[PDB]
């Protein structure tokens, strides 16, 4: 079987995307942030506090002949970002673009934090890291790609994430016309849980190459592109005017610069990020002061491949026995 969903910024920076998934009999319609940086399908809900949630849909277990109490079963979770969310779980027909998983682990959140609540635009999460990650107890849950892949054509997702524009989330198949050139595939780790792999490198502009191993992760649900302060400090060097501010919590660069690109190594291969890209907007309305997409990961622990990056790429989860990360440029 194979699914294909559009995925679409929730707004003008791209600081997140939301695909529509189908959940329940009949289908009640959620718009999710696909995120292979976790593994818990969640939801805002008929359950959630009513004080937490403004503007999301909600997915009202109660209304779906098809959904059944998981007895017992709790989850909790808090991510990078501080943010975070908890409650019950309810096993649940889920379909995305068409391909679809019976007795899927659906979230449902009886508490969302601040953050959530003040996101209209998103109604929860579908996590798409490996299933040792979920957080439910005392039966842990597996992601929708997990439950799917065995009768996916291929065991393979894809994402084509947008700059400024809708993308694409494709289960089950490559579609080849996405993408220029060959893609190249790079070995993963799973220990973490993650889609942790190498880069080869990077440049800064048109700067020479820097060959030099970066171990992160692939995650479309960071919105920035996140590595070592060495790296960051040399792409930022190269724009007038731009420092690192404690206030603000990143490097900022004034709104007049024209950034450079950035170039980081998949094997052999080579994917650059336009300085558009990186380009995140004043810190505040009317600030000529304006926030970078690339930050240090030193306060992190991890080096993060975020959107900023993934969406000059298009990037392939390879699910086989052995995973694999693709990356092709388009």
Same mark, same amino acid.
């Given at each position: 079987?194979?699914?294909?969903?559009?995925?679409?910024?929730?707004?003008?920076? %791209?600081?997140?995307?939301?695909?529509? $998934?189908?959940?329940?009999?009949?289908?009640?319609?959620?718009?999710?942030?696909?995120?292979?940086? =976790?593994?818990?399908?969640?939801?805002?809900?008929?359950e959630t506090?009513?004080?937490?949630? %403004?503007?999301?849909?909600?997915?009202?277990?109660?209304?779906?002949?098809?959904?059944?109490?998981?007895?017992?079963?709790?989850?909790? &979770?808090?991510?990078?970002?501080?943010?975070?969310? =908890?409650?019950?779980?309810?096993?649940?027909?889920?379909?995305?673009?068409?391909?679809?998983?019976?007795? /899927?682990? $659906?979230?449902?959140?009886?508490?969302?934090?601040? =953050?959530?609540?003040?996101?209209?635009? &998103?109604?929860?999460?579908?996590?798409?890291?490996?299933?040792?990650?979920?957080?439910?107890?005392?039966?842990? /849950?597996?992601?929708?790609?997990?439950?799917?892949?065995?009768?996916?054509?291929?065991?393979?997702?894809?994402?084509?994430?947008?700059?400024?524009?809708?993308?694409?989330? !494709?289960?089950?198949?490559?579609?080849?016309?996405?993408?220029?050139?060959?893609?190249?595939?790079?070995?993963?780790?799973?220990?973490?849980?993650?889609?942790?792999?190498?880069?080869?490198?990077?440049?800064?502009?048109?700067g020479t190459?820097?060959s030099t191993?970066?171990?992160?992760?692939?995650?479309?649900?960071?919105?920035?592109?996140?590595?070592?302060?060495?790296?960051?400090?040399?792409?930022?060097?190269?724009?007038?005017?731009?420092?690192?501010?404690? +206030?603000?919590?990143?490097? $900022?660069?004034?709104? +007049?610069?024209?950034?450079?690109? #950035?170039?980081?190594?998949?094997? *052999?291969?080579? &994917?650059?990020?336009?300085?558009?890209?990186?380009? #995140?907007?004043?810190? +505040?309305?009317? *600030?000529?002061?304006?926030?970078?997409?690339?930050?240090?990961?030193?306060?992190?622990?991890? !080096?993060?491949?975020?959107? $900023?990056?993934?969406?000059?790429?298009?990037?392939?989860? !390879?699910?086989?026995?052995?995973?694999?990360?693709?990356?092709?440029?388009?």
């Amino acid at each position: 079987s194979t699914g294909s969903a559009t995925t679409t910024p929730i707004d003008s920076l %791209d600081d997140a995307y939301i695909t529509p $998934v189908q959940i329940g009999t009949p289908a009640q319609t959620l718009n999710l942030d696909f995120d292979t940086g =976790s593994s818990d399908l969640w939801v805002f809900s008929s359950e959630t506090t009513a004080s937490e949630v %403004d503007g999301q849909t909600i997915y009202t277990p109660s209304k779906s002949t098809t959904a059944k109490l998981l007895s017992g079963a709790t989850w909790s &979770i808090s991510y990078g970002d501080g943010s975070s969310s =908890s409650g019950d779980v309810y096993t649940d027909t889920v379909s995305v673009g068409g391909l679809t998983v019976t007795g /899927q682990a $659906v979230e449902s959140a009886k508490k969302v934090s601040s =953050s959530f609540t003040e996101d209209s635009t &998103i109604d929860g999460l579908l996590g798409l890291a490996f299933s040792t990650l979920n957080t439910v107890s005392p039966t842990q /849950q597996k992601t929708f790609f997990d439950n799917a892949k065995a009768s996916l054509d291929s065991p393979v997702f894809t994402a084509d994430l947008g700059y400024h524009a809708p993308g694409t989330y !494709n289960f089950g198949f490559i579609d080849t016309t996405a993408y220029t050139g060959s893609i190249t595939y790079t070995a993963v780790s799973t220990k973490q849980g993650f889609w942790e792999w190498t880069s080869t490198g990077y440049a800064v502009g048109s700067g020479t190459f820097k060959s030099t191993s970066i171990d992160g992760i692939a995650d479309t649900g960071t919105t920035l592109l996140y590595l070592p302060a060495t790296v960051v400090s040399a792409y930022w060097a190269q724009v007038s005017g731009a420092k690192s501010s404690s +206030s603000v919590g990143g490097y $900022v660069f004034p709104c +007049s610069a024209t950034l450079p690109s #950035f170039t980081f190594g998949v094997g *052999s291969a080579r &994917i650059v990020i336009p300085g558009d890209y990186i380009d #995140f907007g004043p810190i +505040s309305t009317g *600030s000529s002061s304006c926030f970078g997409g690339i930050q240090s990961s030193a306060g992190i622990g991890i !080096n993060i491949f975020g959107d $900023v990056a993934l969406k000059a790429a298009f990037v392939v989860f !390879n699910g086989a026995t052995t995973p694999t990360l693709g990356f092709a440029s388009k």
